[PDB]
Design a protein around this ligand. Sequence first.
Ligand SMILES: [Br-]
Ligand SMILES: [Br-]
Ligand SMILES: [Br-]
Ligand SMILES: [Br-]
Ligand SMILES: [Br-]
Ligand SMILES: [Br-]
Ligand SMILES: [Br-]
Ligand code: NA
Length: 129
Amino acid sequence: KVFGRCELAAAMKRHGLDNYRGYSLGNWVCAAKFESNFNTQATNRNTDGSTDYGILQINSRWWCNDGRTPGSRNLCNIPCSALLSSDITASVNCAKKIVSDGNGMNAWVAWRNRCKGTDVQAWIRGCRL
Ligand SMILES: [Br-]
Ligand SMILES: [Br-]
Ligand SMILES: [Br-]
Ligand SMILES: [Br-]
Ligand SMILES: [Br-]
Ligand SMILES: [Br-]
Ligand SMILES: [Br-]
Ligand code: NA
């Protein structure tokens, strides 16, 4: 499923992401846009053999199990396929654990490179919230 911008904002807000760990709602919508283009079915292989999954491109090296990343951990205790549902609950709960591990949203390289320090409010502008 390809969310719309204001649709994903409201879905993130309902799952308690707005201002989670100090990060306003626009940061998370921006991060989803540049990691997945709002597509819950997005996947991308990394050079090391791991794969990134779902609307927030969560990495199989650390966070989920896909059965083909030798020596990885499964810290969210979840199969990576659960991160590809049209319901974003599993993705949101795993993001809350990632963003609390010490490096904040710098864990998402596109956030650091394309969202950090920008007018992130523009991403929720005009949405009925
Ligand atoms: Br957009
Ligand atoms: Br594995
Ligand atoms: Br394979
Ligand atoms: Br583990
Ligand atoms: Br949802
Ligand atoms: Br932080
Ligand atoms: Br914002
Ligand atoms: Na893993």
